[PDB]
Write a protein that binds this ligand. Structure first.
Ligand SMILES: Cc1cc2nc3c(=O)[nH]c(=O)nc-3n(C[C@H](O)[C@H](O)[C@H](O)COP(=O)(O)OP(=O)(O)OC[C@H]3O[C@@H](n4cnc5c(N)ncnc54)[C@H](O)[C@@H]3O)c2cc1C
Length: 472
């Protein structure tokens, strides 16, 4: 049938291929040696760690990733329960515990303000450009009605957790009016115990034999042409995919699923002729930030067996001091804390420029510095050093160049719709998490965008017979 090339074998590319293959001549071209992309589960410390996607966000009926995980046998009773579908130790950098009552009070203050960002939905000329500016103004009003330093330090950790959630260096970089367009499905977030990559491996396995080609990065997509196949008779095609290895692959349709960070760096060379201006501008304007994981293995657990998260509050910090491009005093003060892995393993999370700095450090520097942080925040100078480390390095990854999109100051939800806009004749189509207006920065948004592009192409194919139908 028609020749389709899907660029990228993350969940969006795999989802598009699955729908289309189930009769086109279809190949998926993956730059790296395996499938999954930002779903990347690795065998480490004798078990499995998630370098990328970690949770099914909102594991309920309308989440297609939850439905596939269930179909594939990748979830347990708790995760599949009706109860789950319907839905900590806090340390200060002074080495003392933070009161649960005070933490609850500040969580209510902060998350109440996050809910108020909905007041800006559909506003053309917002008073403040960013979520961070709105939050800071409201916190300043609260402070004028108020220990005060301790409250501001706890609030600073909530800002840093929000940076992880948005995948931004700062909430001051996140556009205010578009913020509430992101949709949260119900359900208590859950992991896939065998690794998130089990999901993408199963979708790949259902494709026809050898659909996905690995270590096959694409250099340039040549479109808007009339290109002859290197065979006699020379059948003509609108597109040629030029691979980094020199392969010249003709196609009728190319579905691009590469990450937004890759497009920001390479859009000028990756498409010939250039992308239309409004699409090129959407790529530039949208946000694409870094969030990384730092796994630390210990010989023995120093935490309580029941502890799930070791949250850190950095004393004397305040969100009212920080601006959109300011850095914390040291890179590790951007770390929110550590999740206990369910061997004794912790998983630290860090977003932004301090996270990109962490990637430039050696494994030894990260391990030693974090051992020192842990000795400091737990108030135990004799805490044993971590045995080993495994960290993600998403900003450094040449085919990704960050973690996930956000609607940055200067962009709107309309830019995510421009990312999805196909090129004329559906010669080039776009899927991926940064093409979904309400589920961007998730696995289910990437999956849904791949199904969207497959449905768009099937409708074109089904319409071709009508070109030959006369009126009389
Ligand atoms: C640290 C981190 C934490 C996250 N946490 C969560 C979470 O808990 N839950 C959740 O739902 N989502 C989370 N996400 C987001 C989620 O992982 C992504 O939104 C989703 O996996 C993106 O899928 P995709 O198909 O759009 O892109 P990708 O998975 O990035 O796939 C794109 C593919 O294109 C390939 N590629 C790039 N350039 C080329 C080229 N030139 N030629 C060929 N191939 C190319 C890449 O190698 C890659 O395999 C997280 C992501 C990260 C990195």
């Amino acid at each position: 049938g028609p020749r389709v090339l899907v660029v990228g074998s993350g969940i969006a590319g795999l989802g598009a291929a699955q729908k289309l293959c189930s009769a086109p001549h279809l190949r998926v071209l993956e730059a790296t040696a395996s499938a999954g992309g930002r779903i990347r589960s690795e065998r480490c410390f004798g078990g499995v760690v998630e370098l990328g996607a970690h949770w099914i966000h909102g594991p309920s009926q309308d989440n297609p990733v939850f439905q596939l995980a269930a179909e594939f046998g990748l979830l347990g009773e708790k995760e599949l329960s009706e109860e789950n579908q319907l839905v900590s130790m806090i340390w200060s950098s002074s080495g003392t515990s933070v009161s649960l009552e005070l933490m609850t009070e500040m969580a209510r203050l902060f998350y109440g303000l996050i809910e108020r960002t909905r007041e800006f939905l559909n506003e053309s000329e917002t008073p403040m450009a960013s979520v961070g500016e709105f939050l800071k103004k409201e916190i300043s009003q609260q402070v004028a009605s108020w220990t005060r330093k301790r409250k501001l330090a706890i609030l600073n950790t909530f800002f840093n957790i929000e940076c992880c959630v948005s995948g931004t260096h700062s909430m001051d970089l996140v556009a205010l009016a578009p913020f509430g367009e992101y949709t949260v499905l119900p359900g208590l977030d859950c992991i896939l115990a065998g690794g998130y990559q089990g999901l993408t491996d199963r979708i790949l396995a259902s494709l026809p034999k050898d659909t996905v080609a690995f270590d096959k990065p694409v250099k340039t997509i040549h479109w808007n042409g009339s290109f002859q196949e290197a065979a006699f008779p020379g059948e003509t095609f609108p597109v040629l995919v030029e691979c980094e290895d020199g392969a010249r692959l003709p196609a009728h349709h190319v579905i691009v699923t590469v990450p937004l960070g890759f497009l920001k760096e390479h859009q000028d060379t990756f498409f010939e002729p250039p992308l239309p201006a409004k699409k090129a501008e959407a790529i530039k304007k949208l946000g694409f930030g870094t969030n990384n994981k730092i796994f630390l293995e210990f010989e023995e657990p120093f935490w309580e067996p029941d502890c799930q998260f070791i949250q850190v509050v950095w004393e004397d910090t305040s969100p009212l001091q920080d601006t959109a491009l300011s850095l914390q005093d040291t890179w590790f003060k951007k770390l929110i804390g550590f999740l206990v892995q369910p061997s004794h393993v912790l998983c630290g999370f860090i977003a932004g420029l301090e996270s990109e700095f962490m990637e430039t450090l050696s494994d030894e520097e990260v391990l030693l510095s974090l051992t020192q942080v842990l000795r400091r925040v737990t108030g135990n100078p004799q805490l044993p050093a971590a045995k080993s480390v495994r960290r993600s390095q998403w900003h450094s990854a040449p085919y990704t160049r960050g973690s996930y999109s956000y609607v940055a100051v200067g962009s709107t939800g309309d830019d995510l719709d421009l990312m999805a806009q196909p090129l004329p004749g559906l010669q080039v189509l776009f899927a991926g998490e940064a093409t979904h207006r309400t589920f961007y920065s998730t696995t289910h948004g990437a999956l849904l965008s791949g199904w969207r592009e497959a449905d768009r192409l099937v409708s074109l194919w089904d319409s071709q017979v009508e070109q030959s139908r006369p009126r009389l």
